[PDB]
């Protein structure tokens, strides 16, 4: 169905590495038969608490659509990458898709 | 037992009158379909007694419908069990 | 794993392995070398390492422990039984034309195409260096020296785990429970070893011990004081403090050298 | 945490009353001992019934 994942990267990476990781994550979905909708990059935000002795991180949102049979390998190739620190994937329905659309249409 | 509207319409049209979603034959076919598609899930989730009991309940409903058919018309019962491979 | 019915007293408690993962019975002729067995006798002829006799002469299959063909995918052709070890073999055929006898994993079936090298994926069967095995994976056939072969976790059902990585060495939990450091350039195979149902096999018979190559072991307690330091005594008697044959204590006495030059790689003992 | 910025007795009394208000002076005396669910589930049906009969 409609899924949405948000993940944080390591703040010690460069702009060329944070741009070479998101593309490797997005080519993982476009090869199994997905359709990326809105790839958002909030940037270098601060964390409420400390994760791995770090207090900052690059946030990213994917918000894709793919059958649920290819959602386990996508999760393993999140905890097998050492550049990430946290990730969260949640499903959306006909109460959150509309909010996502109307908040993306709000700049 | 992943049942969609299209799948239900197809399994009812296979027995006839796709709009007749109350016929005993169509109900028995649907029960058999979602029992065959559930006994397989019960092979990888052998500790799912919650769905084992629902499978038993579906078997009971199908047996009630089969008894109704057996008591009303003896020919339709044999026809349905021969075409659906039920009753051992 | 089958449980034989108690028809005979030598068959009451016998438990036979199932061998459910074995497919082919005939081995490969080009990958077999001759091997003879010894009764513990060394080169000069003296019987060292006693209690080993002989039974059911076997043949040796050349196992490929290095697996130094990187970038060439190989397909599993058959899963066979090796009498010279505990795990199944599962012959491989490479894409170029070679045929090898690497050791099998737990989830290695007939038809899988696995690739070696550092650019491979961390799947079951594939081999990768410890600098690229991600973390906490259940690995096996860990190399102790780069380019030499497989040493650790080679028996049926064993495995190790990656712990951390510090510059040059990675911490690994051996099957015995020992935590030790291994160079990052060493290779390893993902996935547990085969059989895994070997500990469940019972003999129920003195004859199987001799089929396997063993011989009966006499207790030094039922001996004379000229044969063992624990024998002798009118009536049934003990042997005092258990020695081996030369006064070496046989309960708690550690035999590892406290000046072992490889002591800088051990983090816990558990042995 | 209970970080409180900053006489000293006034700030000390403020901190003490905030500590008594945040519900902790009695929260640790309940965790010092073990209360199993069979006894923690009756102090609710005996408190709600009292609050209902007090209405």
């Amino acid at each position: 169905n409609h899924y949405e994942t948000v993940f944080i990267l390591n703040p010690v990476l460069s702009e060329v590495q944070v741009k070479e990781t998101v593309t490797k994550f997005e080519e993982f979905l476009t090869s199994r038969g997905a359709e990326m909708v809105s790839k958002e990059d909030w940037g270098l935000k601060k964390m409420a608490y400390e994760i791995q002795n770090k207090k900052s991180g690059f946030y990213h949102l994917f918000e894709f659509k793919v059958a649920g049979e290819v959602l386990i390998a996508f999760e393993t190739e999140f905890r097998r990458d050492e550049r990430v620190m946290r990730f969260l994937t949640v499903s959306l329905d006909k109460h959150a898709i509309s909010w996502a659309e109307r908040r993306r249409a709000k700049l | 037992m992943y049942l969609t509207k299209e799948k239900k319409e197809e399994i009812f049209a296979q027995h006839g009158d796709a709009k007749n979603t109350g016929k005993a034959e169509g109900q028995i076919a649907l029960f058999t379909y979602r029992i065959s598609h559930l006994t397989e899930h019960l092979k990888k989730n052998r500790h799912d007694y919650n769905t084992e009991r629902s499978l038993v309940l579906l078997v009971g409903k199908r047996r009630a419908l089969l008894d109704y058919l057996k008591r009303k018309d003896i020919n339709r019962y044999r026809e349905i069990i021969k075409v659906l491979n039920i009753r051992k | 794993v089958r449980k034989l019915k108690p028809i005979t007293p030598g068959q009451r408690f016998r438990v036979v392995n199932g061998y459910d993962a074995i497919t082919t019975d005939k081995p490969e002729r080009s990958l077999i070398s001759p091997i003879k067995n010894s009764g513990g006798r060394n080169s000069q002829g003296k019987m060292t390492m006693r209690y080993t006799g002989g039974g059911h002469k076997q043949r040796y299959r050349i196992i490929d422990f290095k697996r130094t063909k990187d970038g060439i995918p190989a397909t599993v052709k058959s899963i066979e039984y090796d009498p010279n070890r505990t795990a199944f073999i599962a012959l491989l055929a490479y894409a170029d034309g070679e045929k090898t006898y690497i050791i099998a994993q737990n989830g290695l079936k007939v038809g899988q195409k696995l690739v070696s090298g550092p650019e491979s994926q961390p799947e079951i069967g594939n081999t990768l260096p410890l600098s690229r095995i991600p973390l906490g994976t259940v690995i096996s056939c860990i190399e102790l020296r780069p380019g030499q072969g497989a040493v650790i976790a080679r028996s049926a059902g064993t495995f190790a785990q990656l712990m951390a990585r510090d510059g040059k060495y990675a911490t690994i939990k051996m099957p015995s429970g020992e935590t030790r450091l291994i160079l990052l350039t060493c290779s390893a195979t993902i996935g547990e070893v085969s059989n895994s149902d070997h500990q469940l096999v019972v003999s129920g018979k003195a004859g199987r011990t001799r089929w396997l190559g063993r011989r009966p072991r006499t207790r030094p307690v039922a001996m004379n004081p000229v044969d063992h330091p624990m024998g002798g005594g009118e009536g049934r008697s003990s042997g005092g403090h258990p020695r081996s044959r030369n006064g070496l204590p046989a309960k708690g006495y550690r035999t590892r050298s406290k000046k072992n030059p490889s002591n800088k790689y051990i983090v816990e003992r558990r042995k | 945490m209970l970080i409180i910025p900053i006489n000293i007795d006034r700030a000390l009394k403020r901190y003490k009353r905030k500590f008594d208000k945040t519900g902790t002076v009695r929260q640790l005396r309940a965790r010092t001992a073990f209360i199993k669910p069979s006894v923690v589930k009756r102090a609710q049906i005996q408190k709600a019934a009292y609050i209902q009969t007090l209405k």
Binding site: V6, I8, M47, A48, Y49, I51, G57, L61, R86, L88, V90, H95, A96, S98, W99, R103 | - | - | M1, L2, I3, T22
Partner: protein, 65 residues
């Protein structure tokens, strides 16, 4: 003492708004009881799981002051 979600037309509770999720949390970072906010149970469950999701995503702290 009404429900701010039943009065309006909001059916979802987003978790990516740390500034919006501060209206249902204590001064020390604890979920406020729905008695003080008038929120119905159906939406209180959703706001609680949203606060927990934000805590996991490190947008709201576990131990604050």
């Amino acid at each position: 003492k009404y429900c701010r979600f039943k009065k309006s037309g909001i059916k979802y509770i987003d978790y990516k708004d740390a500034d919006f999720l501060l209206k249902f949390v204590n001064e020390q970072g604890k979920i406020l009881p729905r008695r003080l906010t008038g929120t119905s149970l159906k939406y209180q469950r959703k706001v609680s799981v949203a606060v927990k999701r934000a805590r996991h995503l490190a947008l709201m702290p576990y131990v604050a002051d």
